[PDB]
From Swiss-Prot:
EC number from the UniProt entry: 3.4.22.64
Designated gene of the protein: Casp4
Record-listed (Microbial infection) ADP-riboxanated arginine modification sites: R174
Species this chain originates from: Mus musculus
Residues of the full protein shown: 101 to 373 of 373
One Gene Ontology biological process: non-canonical inflammasome complex assembly
Principal location class: cytoplasm
Protein name: Caspase-4
Length: 234
């Protein structure tokens, strides 16, 4: 389980390192929202078996971090774009301090695949469109707030960071019982280090664990201007 951060450390860091961390809102009156989009069944592509474990894993972790998790499954690229636009306009963001975006499906070189995707009939959502939907102009509720994008895609912008894994689907699961190596190790490191490490160190420790145990997940499009401490339990 996720080990929590005491209120003494929370206030001590917030009063002693105020200029260097993103401002966190207290749990009382806070409405953190996160969005998980996952595609398992495809008309032309193979089924992403085991993705259900990833969904339950991430949503559980995000709830322990204080996020009300919207879950959307089996969408086309046009459906993904519309669901992202709907999620970006949520008024709850104006009383939140951050958001998480989890994207799990098959992937192309510069985009993530929808349910209808084929090389003859493309159904792809470009990653550029994701950043435009959530930027400062088009998403006023999340201005100057960290926007974390977790992508598992089997193959003005500011305050963004993406963690990116494209391992082939049939090679990303240890058993038929767990989730993926990427999601499992991400959850494990978050449960262990979120109470004492900011977001970038957590991603680095996930990458360190991949060296000890295959291509490694990448940190991408990082435009964070502060350290992002989650302060779990506050």
């Amino acid at each position: 389980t996720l080990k929590l951060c005491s209120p003494e450390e929370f206030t001590r860091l917030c009063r002693e390192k105020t200029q260097e961390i993103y401002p966190i809102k207290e749990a009382n009156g806070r409405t953190r929202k996160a969005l998980i989009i996952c595609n398992t069944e495809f008309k032309h592509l193979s089924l992403r078996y085991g993705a259900n474990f990833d969904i339950i894993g991430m949503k559980g972790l995000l709830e322990d971090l204080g996020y009300d998790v919207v879950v959307k499954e089996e969408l086309t690229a046009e459906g993904m774009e519309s669901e992202m636009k709907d999620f970006a306009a949520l008024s709850e963001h104006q009383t939140s301090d951050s958001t998480f975006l989890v994207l799990m499906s098959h992937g192309t070189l510069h985009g993530i695949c929808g349910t209808m995707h084929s090389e003859k009939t493309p159904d792809v959502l470009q990653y550029d469109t994701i950043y435009q939907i959530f930027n400062n102009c088009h998403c006023p509720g999340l201005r100057d707030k960290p926007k974390v994008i977790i992508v598992q895609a089997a193959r003005v912008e500011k305050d963004f960071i993406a963690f990116y894994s494209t391992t082939p689907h049939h090679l990303s699961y240890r058993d038929k019982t767990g989730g993926s190596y990427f999601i499992t190790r991400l959850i494990s490191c978050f449960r262990k280090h979120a109470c004492s490490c900011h977001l970038f160190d957590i991603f680095l420790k996930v990458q360190q664990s991949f060296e000890k145990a295959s291509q490694m997940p990448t940190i991408d499009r990082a435009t964070l201007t502060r350290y992002f401490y989650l302060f779990p339990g506050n």
